[model samples]
Target: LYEDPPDQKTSPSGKPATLKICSWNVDGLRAWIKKKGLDWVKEEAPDILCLQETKCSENKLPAELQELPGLSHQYWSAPSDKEGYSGVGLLSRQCPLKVSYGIGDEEHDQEGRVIVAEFDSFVLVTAYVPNAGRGLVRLEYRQRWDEAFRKFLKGLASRKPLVLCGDLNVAHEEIDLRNPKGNKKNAGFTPQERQGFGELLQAVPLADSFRHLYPNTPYAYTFWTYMMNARSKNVGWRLDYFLLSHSLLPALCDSKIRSKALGSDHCPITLYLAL
Candidate 1:
């Protein structure tokens, strides 16, 4: 059963005043770390940072990263089938009540793409959704993943407030991507993918934190392609997100896109909550 703490914002005395959650798809952890990405993270000082596409196993993490300062609890999920592939990780200053890997499904667990941390206030989920791939090669599988993930989240929400964050890999609306017309039926912007995402939100009744905060904001993207100076021109997609159960919305203060922070194809998105 899900248990709620006395107050969502109630942390041990002497802790930081605000609860900051950051989500990013590093694309590859090692290379990003080498580029001083960890330094930027340190400077931002998020209470909990959720990472996607870590692309490395636990054994391969460098000592500095394994023992990142200020973050005492580290939870990681790396692929068992393919080396250097899909992975997710979380770093937090406070210990969680419980931690879960994957979505309690063997097939999904093989990719090591989900990590759930049960906290006093909420169930935090870091996910790296499967991409549809070039030519939509993996569209069917991605749809299946969406359904399973939706169910998984709804189950979690049944007990307590939930915060689902990371690279969800879909652009929910035309405004979410730079070139909607050109990208129609594309992997991340396909009608089917968008519909799946919509279904998930409807079923869970969760809100996209960024969208909720800035519903009409334009050119705000988390992912940019390497080709064609996409980042410079802001030809990108808002693929990463922080989806929150409606129960947690009252605590939501600010949602930000750290577009200036570089090192990965995707930049970090942050959620600030009074909780």
Candidate 2:
């Protein structure tokens, strides 16, 4: 379950070919649509796009988002019990072989926070991980989720290499956030969540693509707080991530943070890898 990054290799053509996969937590799809969120997506034109925290049910989704032109094949999962709560979605240029929702456990499945798409070369998973919550009220529930999520990903990886992307909701290390010291026991940076994240990576053999690419790079954040002009000052946490099975590491081309292409608090990230 552990391997160092593959040494860079060049394809015969001089540059390795890449498959385009993008991830974004739109925060609120309806509100994001009003800001022309899809415009950035259109310009980037990813082959597969994974979304988290969409905050809408399929029935409530805007037509503009549901019917995005190039990405014809789509799947969305939302908690039926909640109106504008948690949700995740997938939009693909080509249809997947199959798609499944949730983590395969009824207790964890209640939130509709996960979706997996089976592709020819890989299994794609997009998830909206639960936050530990204010005052750590949901920490225990979050821990259980982490265990179930790790088990799910491991099972999927056993069959085929997988690409997992989403708002993981935890800063895995001090280097991953601007003020880690101040946020130790806070929702995302608590030791409990951090350990869970580390265990998940080691357990599933999933490589953190961004870290694999730039191991020591600092302050390259993906999600920022709304208070105190956090985004403007770059006071952010690297919560959103692109994780791939270690088997896919050599093909990894780029793990890009599209910081400027924003409509929500979190920006989009793209993964370019030879499939």
Candidate 3:
């Protein structure tokens, strides 16, 4: 017979109430599943999983993942106006107290790029920022998105602690990407883009959990180029992140990048916390 959940003392087993959270830009849910991407998620057994660039509606999700054994609380947000584009999803073993989508602005929310889940002690957000298109065409929209996004994040402060994760699409500092000097004006490394990122961090009073634990480290990145065998050469950018409220620092156990786990163009990053 199965044992009941932990009682108040839990037999004094000394098991800390720890939580594991993982985030990934799947590129496309269907494509990643074909490559056995879900296997990694199953093996890790994170308490929560945040996904970006899902590029599919709920009906399109393969049956194998629809009823994942432990992560039963499922939520998704997809663009109403597009197909095979921007989207985000959330899976959790424990049901969130509340779940919301979008950044609370109509024009910006059309792409279905943001999903939020509010838990007992904190609020988790998964945001897929619009990429600055080639030649910096979408740069304008990126700037607008930053402003709205920052406001949305701040608004959640009154609700609970924040754990924001996503493919933010900017390499904040020189150490964030490999060729920062040569890619200054490129879409992800532009000066304007960096400024926007800086503003958000300052405004939210948030810290990149990974960098805090390992400052001065190099080549710890989440997204890598697929061309020229970039993965093999390790030429990559730190595009995905887990930023948390500074007040929650003590609860954070670790931040990790699963660079070797393969399926999409981007790899999954993990955050561990004892809450």
Candidate 4:
């Protein structure tokens, strides 16, 4: 639950052997990349970065982005529908032996929300869970996604332990948000949305790395309301997570909410595994 980052992380050859995995929902990939994201990557050079709301099309990212060096073996999955909308991408130093996209549903697949990459030692899956929308108008559709997503992950777990990360869009518990009691009826805090998150955990052994380690901790939020500078004020929700199976806990050396490093409305969530 609490891992102190080492002075430096090395590679497999043992130069420092630290694997940093980061997830961020860059509202608009083009804008973020041009204005801030590229600079951030150059500074961190994470081993893998899982992105949500990429809002980019297939092989259509800016030329400067595609030319980013030392980020080889990159794999991308963009929304099949409208351009500059919901999408996801996985960038890594290691090339995946296999890659999969979508959840077997044309409608969902068209939104470009899910992608999974399999490596020799583990699997990485990224998703942009559908937002329930204000006033709970899309409750039914959200529930359907919950069920289908559970099945989707279970199918993957059957093959290999998975490192699933993304902007899930649901704050699982009271500790995940700043105003639990006051916003119980709000869209993201409504009972329906909250229950959907519970159902997700019940469907799999996926343990939220941060919550798993610090069960009693509070105010560890990820997504913040844009109104009234919520992010800057630290009034946010733990809507993004890096979940690992029980067997993978040992490798979960550290999990952190990088609330300070900013690019978009939502900051980055990172996890370090010893493997």
Candidate 5:
């Protein structure tokens, strides 16, 4: 599941063409835009942008954000049971063949955890996985979600190659977080949560794009806590990811983190694919 550096190819219109994708947990879309996150987005200008924890309903989205430039198609899913809470969004330059909400499981779909877009080459899935919760209060529910999520991705993979990305809420390896030993019992670093992540990837045999490129790379993280100025200290966790079906490994060009693209607790992660 390795490839050379990013590919360079010419489009039919004589311009360079690339399939650039990005994923991030904005925490709250409104606040992020107020901090000028949109400017960073325009700078990176990914072809597809997947966002988790948007914390707003579709109708409540800011007018400016809803009509952001470059991304012509936008899809959003929010929790019907709550407001200003968990949500996921996807924006793409090209329109998808079809769009779907949820993982088709009533119990897990209510919180707006998943959004699937059917594209020509791959099915893009963005998720805001449920946290295990403080003191592992939601550990059992998180386990159920892990099973459903794995099955959902596998079903999609059976149909087409899939690109699943988001703040998955778990650091599968010690290298994924700065204080793994100290936070071993913490919500996101718990052994059960970590193993759940492993199970999902193994069930579908997905390739973690970033890890595939730099398995031993340390301190390259996607999420940092706001407490104790953890971000400035570089105490963080690689909870966000771009996982591709094993079959799509050849299309992978490069996967990287935009650590400086700051606005939220989590930074944006980019993926370059030939398709």
Candidate 6:
């Protein structure tokens, strides 16, 4: 027989509750699956897994993953405009009271870039921000996205606590990147791009879980380059983040950056809450 859920509580609707949680960028779920897929989830066993850049059409995830650990209820969003790009997923054994997709725009919603799940205590958002294309070509759209996304999150925070996660496609400070002095103008590190990220924090009281916990640490990062042995060399960027609303600050027990458990250039980042 099954024992009690690790985080037993009740939903906003007053039903019995399960742990409301998760954050992960599965980094091409299909490809990873082919390499040892179901095994990965079995090892992690998160209550709710938020994935980024699955790089697969909604139609492509393995059947076993949908049923893994007997948590069949899964939600997914994919780029309607682009194939195999900017996708997000949420898997849970406990049904979310509600789930929503995208940042704004009915038309852009088709691209499946964002998913927000509302639990009793807080709302969890999974996102895959648009990359500022090579040579900063799409930086304009990326900037627009920053503004629109900030507004969206603030609107959510005004209502209740929010846990925002995923590949934000940015490295906020010099410590966030390996060669900040050299890559200052690069797609992910441009001054305008970095400033836009700052604007996001100013727009909301969202606190970066890792950095907030370790203010003086220097080598904390999530995504490493696939080229030139970046992971070994520690040439990486802290692109993945978990930013929580001020309300959830008290119960945040711990946070982590799993740089070694890699299937993609990005290793998973995790956060734990006692309540």
List clash counts for every candidate, in order.
0, 0, 0, 4, 0, 5
User: For model 4, how does the per-residue alpha-carbon lDDT over 71-124 read when each residue is reduced to its tens digit?
Assistant: 776767743557424888888888888988898876566678898999888889
Off by over 4 Å in 1: 1-17, 78-84
Residue 252 in model 3: shift from native, Å? 0.8
Deviation from native of the Cα of residue 63 in model 4, angstroms: 2.0
Tens-digit lDDT string for candidate 5 (148-173): 89998999999999999999999989
Model 5's C-alpha root-mean-square deviation from the true structure amounts to: 4.0
Q: Model 6, 56-124: lDDT tens per residue?
A: 564666776766885667888743546535678887777888999887765446556899989887888
**Model 2 Cα lDDT, one tens digit per residue, 1-275:** 11223434343235674578889999888778777789888988898998888777556667787678789998898447664259888999999999999998877887768999999989999998989999999999999999999999999999999999999999999998999999998999999999999999999989998898889888888989989999988898999999999888777877888877778999888888776
Of 3 and 6, which scores higher on TM-score? Answer: 3
Model 1: worst 10 consecutive residues (lDDT sum): 1-10
Where is model 2 poorest over a 10-residue stretch in terms of lDDT?
1-10
lDDT of all the models against the reference?
Answer: 0.85, 0.86, 0.84, 0.78, 0.85, 0.75
- What does candidate 3's lDDT look like per residue over 1-275, in tens digits? 11112212111234453888989999888898887789988987889999998887554667877777799999888445565258788999998989998988987877778999998889999999998888999899889988999988989975688999989999999999988998887988999899999998999868998788778788877888778987777788999999999878777767888877899999998887778
Clashing pairs in 3: none
TM-score of each: 0.92, 0.93, 0.92, 0.89, 0.92, 0.88
RMSD list, candidates in order: 6.3, 4.3, 6.4, 3.5, 4.0, 6.1
- Model 4 scores worst on lDDT over the 10 consecutive residues at 2-11
Scored by lDDT, model 6 comes in at 0.75
Of the candidates shown, which would achieve the greatest lDDT relative to the real structure?
A: 2
* Superior by lDDT: candidate 1 or candidate 3: 1
Give me the overall lDDT of model 1.
0.85
